[PDB]
Amino acid sequence: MEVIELNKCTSGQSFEVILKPPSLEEIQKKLEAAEERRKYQEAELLKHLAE
Amino acid sequence: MRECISIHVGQAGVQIGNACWELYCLEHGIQPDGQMPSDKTIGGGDDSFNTFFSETGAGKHVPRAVFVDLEPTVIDEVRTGTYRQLFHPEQLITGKEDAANNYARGHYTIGKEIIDLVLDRIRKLADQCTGLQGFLVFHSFGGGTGSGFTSLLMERLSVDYGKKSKLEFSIYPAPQVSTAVVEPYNSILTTHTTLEHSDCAFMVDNEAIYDICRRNLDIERPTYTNLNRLISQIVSSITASLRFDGALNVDLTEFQTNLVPYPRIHFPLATYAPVISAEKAYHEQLSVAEITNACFEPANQMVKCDPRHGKYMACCLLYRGDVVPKDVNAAIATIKTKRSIQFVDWCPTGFKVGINYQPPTVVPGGDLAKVQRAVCMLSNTTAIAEAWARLDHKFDLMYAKRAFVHWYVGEGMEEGEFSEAREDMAALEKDYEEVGVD
Amino acid sequence: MREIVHIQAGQCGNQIGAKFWEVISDEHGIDPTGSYHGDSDLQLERINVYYNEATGNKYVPRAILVDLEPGTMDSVRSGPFGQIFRPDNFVFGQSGAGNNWAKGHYTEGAELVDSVLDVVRKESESCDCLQGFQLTHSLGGGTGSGMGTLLISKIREEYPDRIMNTFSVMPSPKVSDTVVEPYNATLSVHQLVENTDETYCIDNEALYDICFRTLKLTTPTYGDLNHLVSATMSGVTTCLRFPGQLNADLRKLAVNMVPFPRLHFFMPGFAPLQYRALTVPELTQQMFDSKNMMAACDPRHGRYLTVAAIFRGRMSMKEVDEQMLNVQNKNSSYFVEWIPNNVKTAVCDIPPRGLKMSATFIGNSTAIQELFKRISEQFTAMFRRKAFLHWYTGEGMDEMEFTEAESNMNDLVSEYQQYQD
Amino acid sequence: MYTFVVRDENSSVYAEVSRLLLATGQWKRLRKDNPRFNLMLGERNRLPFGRLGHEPGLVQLVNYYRGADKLCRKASLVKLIKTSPELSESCTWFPESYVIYPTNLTDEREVFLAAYNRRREGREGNVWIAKSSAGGILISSEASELLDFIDEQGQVHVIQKYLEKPLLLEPGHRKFDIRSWVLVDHLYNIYLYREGVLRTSSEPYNSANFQDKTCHLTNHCIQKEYSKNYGRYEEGNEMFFEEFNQYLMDALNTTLENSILLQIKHIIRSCLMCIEPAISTKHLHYQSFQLFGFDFMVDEELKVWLIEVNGAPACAQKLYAELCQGIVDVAISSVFPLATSIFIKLHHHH
Numbered sequence A: 001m002e003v004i005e006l007n008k009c010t011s012g013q014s015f016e017v018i019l020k021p022p023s024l025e026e027i028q029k030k031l032e033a034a035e036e037r038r039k040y041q042e043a044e045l046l047k048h049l050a051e
Numbered sequence B: 001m002r003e004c005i006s007i008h009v010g011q012a013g014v015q016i017g018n019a020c021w022e023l024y025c026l027e028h029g030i031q032p033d034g035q036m037p038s039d040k041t042i043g044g045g046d047d048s049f050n051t052f053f054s055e056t057g058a059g060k061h062v063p064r065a066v067f068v069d070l071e072p073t074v075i076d077e078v079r080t081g082t083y084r085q086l087f088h089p090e091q092l093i094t095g096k097e098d099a100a101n102n103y104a105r106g107h108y109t110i111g112k113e114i115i116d117l118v119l120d121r122i123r124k125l126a127d128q129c130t131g132l133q134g135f136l137v138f139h140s141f142g143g144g145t146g147s148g149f150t151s152l153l154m155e156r157l158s159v160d161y162g163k164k165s166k167l168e169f170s171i172y173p174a175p176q177v178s179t180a181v182v183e184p185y186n187s188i189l190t191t192h193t194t195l196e197h198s199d200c201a202f203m204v205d206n207e208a209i210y211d212i213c214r215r216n217l218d219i220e221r222p223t224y225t226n227l228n229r230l231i232s233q234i235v236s237s238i239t240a241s242l243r244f245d246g247a248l249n250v251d252l253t254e255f256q257t258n259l260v261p262y263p264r265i266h267f268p269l270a271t272y273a274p275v276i277s278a279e280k281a282y283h284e285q286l287s288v289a290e291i292t293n294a295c296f297e298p299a300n301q302m303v304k305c306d307p308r309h310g311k312y313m314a315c316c317l318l319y320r321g322d323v324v325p326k327d328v329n330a331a332i333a334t335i336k337t338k339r340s341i342q343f344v345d346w347c348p349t350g351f352k353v354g355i356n357y358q359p360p361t362v363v364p365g366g367d368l369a370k371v372q373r374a375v376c377m378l379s380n381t382t383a384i385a386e387a388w389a390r391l392d393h394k395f396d397l398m399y400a401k402r403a404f405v406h407w408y409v410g411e412g413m414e415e416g417e418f419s420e421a422r423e424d425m426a427a428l429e430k431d432y433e434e435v436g437v438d
Numbered sequence C: 001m002r003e004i005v006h007i008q009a010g011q012c013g014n015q016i017g018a019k020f021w022e023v024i025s026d027e028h029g030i031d032p033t034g035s036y037h038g039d040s041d042l043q044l045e046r047i048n049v050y051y052n053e054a055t056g057n058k059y060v061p062r063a064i065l066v067d068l069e070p071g072t073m074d075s076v077r078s079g080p081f082g083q084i085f086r087p088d089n090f091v092f093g094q095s096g097a098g099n100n101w102a103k104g105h106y107t108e109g110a111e112l113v114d115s116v117l118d119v120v121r122k123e124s125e126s127c128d129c130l131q132g133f134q135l136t137h138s139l140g141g142g143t144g145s146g147m148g149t150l151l152i153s154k155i156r157e158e159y160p161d162r163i164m165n166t167f168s169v170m171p172s173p174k175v176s177d178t179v180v181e182p183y184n185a186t187l188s189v190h191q192l193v194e195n196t197d198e199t200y201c202i203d204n205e206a207l208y209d210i211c212f213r214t215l216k217l218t219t220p221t222y223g224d225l226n227h228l229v230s231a232t233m234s235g236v237t238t239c240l241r242f243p244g245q246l247n248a249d250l251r252k253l254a255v256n257m258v259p260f261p262r263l264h265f266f267m268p269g270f271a272p273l274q275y276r277a278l279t280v281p282e283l284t285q286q287m288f289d290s291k292n293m294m295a296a297c298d299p300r301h302g303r304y305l306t307v308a309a310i311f312r313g314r315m316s317m318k319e320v321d322e323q324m325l326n327v328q329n330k331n332s333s334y335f336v337e338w339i340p341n342n343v344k345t346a347v348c349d350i351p352p353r354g355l356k357m358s359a360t361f362i363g364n365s366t367a368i369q370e371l372f373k374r375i376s377e378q379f380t381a382m383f384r385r386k387a388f389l390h391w392y393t394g395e396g397m398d399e400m401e402f403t404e405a406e407s408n409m410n411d412l413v414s415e416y417q418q419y420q421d
Numbered sequence D: 001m002y003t004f005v006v007r008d009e010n011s012s013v014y015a016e017v018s019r020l021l022l023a024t025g026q027w028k029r030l031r032k033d034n035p036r037f038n039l040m041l042g043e044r045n046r047l048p049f050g051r052l053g054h055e056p057g058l059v060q061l062v063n064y065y066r067g068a069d070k071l072c073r074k075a076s077l078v079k080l081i082k083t084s085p086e087l088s089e090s091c092t093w094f095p096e097s098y099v100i101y102p103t104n105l106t107d108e109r110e111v112f113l114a115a116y117n118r119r120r121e122g123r124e125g126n127v128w129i130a131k132s133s134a135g136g137i138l139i140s141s142e143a144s145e146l147l148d149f150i151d152e153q154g155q156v157h158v159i160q161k162y163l164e165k166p167l168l169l170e171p172g173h174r175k176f177d178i179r180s181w182v183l184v185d186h187l188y189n190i191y192l193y194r195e196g197v198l199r200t201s202s203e204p205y206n207s208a209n210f211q212d213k214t215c216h217l218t219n220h221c222i223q224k225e226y227s228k229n230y231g232r233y234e235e236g237n238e239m240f241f242e243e244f245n246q247y248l249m250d251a252l253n254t255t256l257e258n259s260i261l262l263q264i265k266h267i268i269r270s271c272l273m274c275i276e277p278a279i280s281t282k283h284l285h286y287q288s289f290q291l292f293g294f295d296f297m298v299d300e301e302l303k304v305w306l307i308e309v310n311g312a313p314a315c316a317q318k319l320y321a322e323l324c325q326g327i328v329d330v331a332i333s334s335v336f337p338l339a340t341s342i343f344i345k346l347h348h349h350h
């Protein structure tokens, strides 16, 4: 039961008690590649509607 | 003094942030109009509370926080609520249509349109920071904005603020207080893309916060007000080290040093006590030994799991109120001989103890009784992996049928990103299994 | 400020749309002149989702009445609430549709549709942020069926990222106007599969059964059938028109309700359906009962993908959960197990007019294929002899288009078939 | 309507429990993967405890205690007794045991050898037995044969002192063991099934020949296979408590209660009480119960020795109905109530 690093101040204190020792370029390519897949998705939705 | 910037994303993040800054003003003696009679440094100062509050020449104490959401309803409350005089209108950012509980919508479609406005609003706060420590990101797992926009913001903050710490306060999805069915997807999707950008994440399961409200506070059907008034108490326990004098967890880096030995296992379990209903006219005051031992009862955990079947890598005891080290060490011994506290071999068996004398502040007309001493125990246990198992399982049940996948693919995201994130979560569970099981 | 644009097409569409506006106007405290006289802010919190704000604090429904004949919209304008609608939003022709999908979709409706889209465009432009569209119509007629789907076909081409929902009244021989209702419904369903996010299936046969047996109504009329549709429509929109933790937009509701893009046809239900108060256990047991559902499909024959339940009024949310759980445990084998937590509950403090409490049911069930199987059988019964096709080929349609609609309907029945085993 | 699932399609015990639940018409069985259950009859291994107690409005109960394997694993029990203070290394009712890992892989080889050498160095009996959970048992009096037997295997083996002076049933001059079925409900009330079974050896005991393990191992499967006197004395080499209590009186002028049952009851309390703080589901979000099968040895001095604890035991054919119903009455209906107890409550301090 060892107490180490006992730091005390006015509003409290802290310490440690030991019991046992140890035994940007690519971010746009993904936001743009998904924007091109939406454009291509709506590009097939409009062409479908043109037919 | 080094500053901390708080970022609240989505309805969960924003509403929790509303309760936290209320408590902060009460704890530091800051009036709703931003005045602080005790602060003798007018318009300046490098005190502990100045890590969370800047000062204008007018003596107003303005939180260092940014609120972001894709729809305006929840942020409009702040623009007219009690503390509407604290925040400048620039700190409150809103879009016009939300992410519809859709990660892809919050990360790609809508997010890409507002990301640079958020970063600019954040940069403006940084410009006021002589030594920025990093950021605290409040958000939900299951929301389309809390999940999808948070990870995007986290990716970006890494690029612009490389050497800065980023801690999360995450809401884990509980089906009893939510009305979604795609939350398993959003949680795994955002955890996947956020893992390498968060130094330390404190999850809070709505299922656990909910049961505490019913059991200790006698609330039949709790509301988000009850849930967040309690969450703020825990969050206050965790950030008190940054806003008051002390030596434990004095900066965001010390959170990783003291709680996260392995970079990926950065999900400490939180345990709080006491939680006493205020309706009780007179409740007996618990001792250091009684509250300390409560930090090992499951019913006081922010996530429901069983630490008796895990291994600890770290453990912090944050005391508030009438607590002397003599009584802490005494109780710590009484809990070793009666509790299943199995640390890992490559780690010492001990506890980092912090004591702040100011007892927990209660919000006027709230749910919590005034206690003379409280404690929050942050512990890094492999039993929190139970939470990932539950989530991954639900994800797997839907993703086998591709249920709801079209909503995500339709918003730009690729289907591969699903299993890519799932394979990561699997590796995360596998890592937890290596560290806590023989 | 999430505006919804309402569109009612044809006789059934305008009559159903009229009672709807009649019902929710009362809930929000709006009289037939657009003046608000309510007593609760919950009525005005989210009033802008179905109502525009005019001079003098008037409230005009964001609605657009469409028809190919003037009779029905003379009734709407001459009615009590008729004066609430925008005079400019009445867009109608004079030829009529003749209960013919081809006339509504290719010829007469084609001549009028552009002008309808000018009114829709006029409403959309004044929208801070448009959620999407809802259309009330029947599928067995000519205007609402043929021109209704034509309208949706052009709203998606111009609003491809807005939600498009319909309240579609399905034809039944039990309550039939003409023998070509299967043709018009088969032709509309395929359009609905491709171009609607959500389609609420309102089967007149189930409505007749509800009025006849349960409601003990000898000879049900259309107005009798519509009172139910009003009550249901008020319910399946409560989460929209009213604030609180249950407030959401169409897209969010669709995200959690539609696990697959084409299986978006819902079974609505309502309760209660005499002054005896209905204990929470009573509301909840009927809400899942087939006799209380308005799609004439036996839930016990299919499986639930998702389910919602809106409770209106004041009661114990605790008692609801207990009774809801008991309902789930008695029908545990009917909810798919690969969608976790797929049965949700919501509460609204404001009950419908003159009711202590009501329950609105919304089910995404694979049992909905019974409805499409009936339509299909009736279709084939006539098409095998090619009976009544001359009404359609005279409008420039070919048989090939009927064969394709028959195939598209069958493919729909099979797609629902896989997710039921 | 209560709901349960069946995830162990081999448990003879709970296959009868399941049938009894349906017989009440108030229990509905779901699919093994339906998460909306009140009671789970879980699988033996890799039972997903982490997914229990997370369903809104559903109280969930499972027929196993997470962490009870520490008591039901060969090597685990020895380590648990030696390390646990409540039991201590000087535990009087557990045969001297040492955990021996195969050399191709802590280990107690040297500790066992020093204990062995001290016996041979003093002329004392030195018969030991080597066994493991993956069984493959060897009875020898030479420390070499036992250790080399373990090196020929790939899993953890245990060596404990072989009781050379067992109580022999007459006529027959034979050996036996006692099987006691224990049940621990969600409240941790320790219930001992009043009825036990003695799995008897149909072969006379021959201490000068440990190679023929048929007269030394009282397993019901060994007797019915390699023993040629099976069922001779008692049906299925199973002697029940009424007959054995009668033999103890006529033969030894004592009773099953005083001479044996008092120690059997004490050994059960000491073990279950030892692991309470680690497996108890008092304040947990789900409830556990479990049926244990304890196996005892009785030497000629009427001293009871614990052999092993089984976490997934079967039951005597003549006792299935009575025991399975009691499980439903004490372990299930106590949590999910319907619309003279066959047990013996072993009072203790929680």
Ligand SMILES: Nc1nc2c(ncn2[C@@H]2O[C@H](COP(=O)(O)OP(=O)(O)OP(=O)(O)O)[C@@H](O)[C@H]2O)c(=O)[nH]1
Binding pocket: B009, B010, B011, B012, B013, B015, B016, B069, B070, B098, B099, B100, B101, B102, B106, B140, B141, B142, B143, B144, B145, B146, B147, B171, B172, B173, B174, B177, B178, B179, B183, B206, B209, B224, B225, B227, B228, B231
């Ligand atoms: N603890 C707590 N949880 C909340 C709160 N508000 C919402 N949640 C949870 O957050 C999840 C829903 O995500 P939201 O935060 O509401 O969604 P969002 O981040 O705004 O993103 P959108 O889908 O675009 O609205 C559900 O699981 C809710 O239970 C809150 O105030 N407190």
Ligand SMILES: Nc1ncnc2c1ncn2[C@@H]1O[C@H](COP(=O)(O)OP(=O)(O)CP(=O)(O)O)[C@@H](O)[C@H]1O
Binding pocket: D095, D129, D131, D135, D160, D161, D162, D163, D164, D175, D176, D177, D216, D217, D218, D219, D295, D297, D307, D308, D310
């Ligand atoms: N120390 C010891 N002294 C005397 N006999 C012993 C003994 N250890 C084991 N035995 C004999 O071995 C038999 C049981 O062996 P053990 O229980 O270790 O194997 P097992 O676990 O595969 C059987 P089960 O699990 O079904 O009870 C008993 O009948 C007993 O006679």
Ligand SMILES: Nc1nc2c(ncn2[C@@H]2O[C@H](COP(=O)(O)OP(=O)(O)O)[C@@H](O)[C@H]2O)c(=O)[nH]1
Binding pocket: C009, C010, C011, C012, C013, C015, C016, C097, C098, C099, C138, C139, C140, C141, C142, C143, C144, C145, C169, C170, C171, C172, C175, C176, C177, C178, C181, C204, C207, C222, C223, C225, C226
């Ligand atoms: N429930 C209900 N069904 C109707 C109503 N009016 C017509 N229908 C049904 O709709 C079909 C006729 O379509 P109709 O609306 O008259 O065609 P349209 O006016 O040309 O668009 C028939 O199957 C009727 O049963 C109504 O007011 N209520």
Ligand SMILES: Cc1cc(C(=O)Nc2ccn(C)n2)on1
Binding pocket: C134, C165, C198, C236, C237, C239, C240, C250, C253, C254, C257, C308, C309, C310, C346, C362
């Ligand atoms: C108009 C309108 C409303 C809806 C809708 O899906 N509403 C829902 C879904 C689930 N709940 C509780 N409400 O669709 N069109």
Ligand SMILES: Cc1cc(C(=O)Nc2ccn(C)n2)on1
Binding pocket: B179, B180, B181, C239, C245, C246, C247, C248, C252, C253, C256, C257, C306, C307, C308, C341, C342, C343, C344, C346
């Ligand atoms: C199945 C299913 C049904 C719902 C549902 O109504 N969701 C709602 C209602 C109101 N909000 C904000 N979300 O979600 N999953």
Ligand SMILES: [Ca+2]
Binding pocket: none
């Ligand atoms: Ca790195």
Ligand SMILES: [Ca+2]
Binding pocket: C111
């Ligand atoms: Ca013309």
Ligand SMILES: [Mg+2]
Binding pocket: B010, B011, B069, B070, B071, B098, B145
């Ligand atoms: Mg939101």
Ligand SMILES: [Mg+2]
Binding pocket: C011, C012, C141, C177
């Ligand atoms: Mg008509």
Ligand SMILES: [Mg+2]
Binding pocket: D135, D136
């Ligand atoms: Mg064996």
